[PDB]
Design an enzyme around this catalytic site. Structure first.
Site, short mmCIF file in Angstrom:
data_model
loop_
_atom_site.label_atom_id
_atom_site.label_comp_id
_atom_site.label_asym_id
_atom_site.label_seq_id
_atom_site.Cartn_x
_atom_site.Cartn_y
_atom_site.Cartn_z
N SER A 269 0.78 -1.23 0.00
CA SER A 269 0.00 0.00 0.00
C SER A 269 0.82 1.30 0.00
CB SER A 269 -1.02 0.03 1.14
OG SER A 269 -2.09 -0.87 0.88
N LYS B 109 0.17 3.81 -2.77
CA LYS B 109 -0.99 4.70 -2.82
C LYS B 109 -0.66 6.18 -2.73
CE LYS B 109 -3.85 0.93 -1.30
NZ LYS B 109 -4.40 0.17 -0.16
N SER C 17 -5.81 3.13 3.96
CA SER C 17 -5.33 2.01 3.14
C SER C 17 -6.42 1.27 2.42
CB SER C 17 -4.47 1.03 3.91
OG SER C 17 -3.34 0.69 3.13
N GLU D 299 -5.31 -3.88 -6.91
CA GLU D 299 -5.55 -4.44 -5.59
C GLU D 299 -6.56 -5.57 -5.72
OE1 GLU D 299 -4.04 -4.08 -2.82
OE2 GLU D 299 -3.31 -2.00 -2.66
N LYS E 137 2.98 6.50 5.25
CA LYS E 137 2.09 5.52 4.68
C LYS E 137 2.73 4.17 4.85
CE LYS E 137 -1.40 3.82 2.48
NZ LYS E 137 -1.31 2.72 3.52
N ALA F 246 1.46 -3.66 3.95
CA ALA F 246 1.58 -5.05 4.40
C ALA F 246 1.12 -5.94 3.25
CB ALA F 246 0.65 -5.28 5.58
#
Ligand SMILES: [Zn+2]
Length: 270
Positions: A50, A53, A110, A146, A214, A217
């Site tokens: 993430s 992002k 997230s 994603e 940010k 995982a």
């Protein structure tokens, strides 16, 4: 030398018995000058998870600056578009969300569907990669959407960065000329309001300090964090930490990253 000792110790602890490719990467930059202050495996690749992002919303803000996109544009979507870990987006099935709200959700919470929605607005992973390469980062790449981009297959370069690439890119986004001063501020404001990285660097942060971060995982031990932080209410350095490949549980990986944070704070220097 002390933070670098801790990073090596972290890797030793996390990887000793992984029985598969396993590493930790770290870099610390001076925010103003870009000077590399210290590093550990700066040019090895890690899954972004993430942490991408932030780069995504950088690309969105670039389009807004260019008059190609609006912070207030509302996007609607269906329940069938919702993917794993969509805490904010699944609360707006009726109303949809604005581009601004989607970036807030992607960065601060997230939210995975928000990231996919935003990927659509810019033309997909290939166009995020294009935007990065066009600003001089020819290492970072997003290939998938994603949640598949978290797969973290050992030594797969899909959806990876290097610590130095990410840190340098983050610096250009937050303080360079890529975005307008208003847009670059919006990007750091979203990072400042991160809600889901408490057990990482934030756990080690002294009173009075500023942090905009940010976390990420993924699968196969992957975990990481990018940050702009500093004493006295203003960021003065960039920190990027990644690991992948460990068989250790979430809490143990969190603790090792927080330990690297505690070291870099204790040993910050002038
Ligand atoms: Zn390129």
């Amino acid at each position: 030398p002390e933070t670098l000792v801790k990073v090596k110790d972290a890797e030793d602890q996390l990887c000793r018995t992984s029985h598969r490719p396993c590493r930790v990467g770290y870099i610390e930059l001076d925010l103003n000058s870009g000077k590399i202050l210290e590093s550990f495996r700066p040019e090895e690749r890690f899954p972004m998870m993430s942490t991408f992002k932030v780069l995504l919303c950088g690309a969105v803000l670039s389009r807004i600056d260019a008059g190609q996109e609006q912070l207030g544009r509302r996007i609607h979507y269906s329940q069938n578009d919702l993917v794993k870990y969509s805490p904010v987006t699944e609360k707006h099935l009726t109303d949809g969300m604005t581009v601004r709200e989607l970036c807030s959700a992607a960065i601060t919470m997230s939210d995975n569907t928000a990231a996919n929605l935003l990927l659509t607005t810019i033309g997909g992973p290939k166009e995020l990669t294009a935007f990065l390469h066009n600003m001089g980062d020819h290492v970072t790449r997003l290939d998938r959407w994603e949640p598949e981009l978290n797969e973290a297959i050992p030594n797969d370069e899909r959806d990876t960065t290097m610590p130095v690439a990410m840190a340098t890119t983050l610096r250009k986004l937050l303080t360079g000329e890529l975005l307008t001063l208003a847009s670059r501020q919006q990007l750091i404001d979203w990072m400042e309001a991160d809600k889901v990285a408490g057990p990482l660097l934030r756990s080690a942060l002294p009173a009075g300090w500023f942090i905009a971060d940010k976390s990420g995982a993924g699968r196969r031990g992957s975990r990481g964090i990018i940050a702009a932080l500093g004493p006295d209410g203003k960021p003065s350095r960039i920190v990027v930490i990644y690991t992948t490949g460990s068989r250790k549980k979430t809490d143990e990986r969190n603790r090792q990253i927080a330990e690297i944070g505690a070291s870099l704070i204790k040993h910050w220097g002038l």
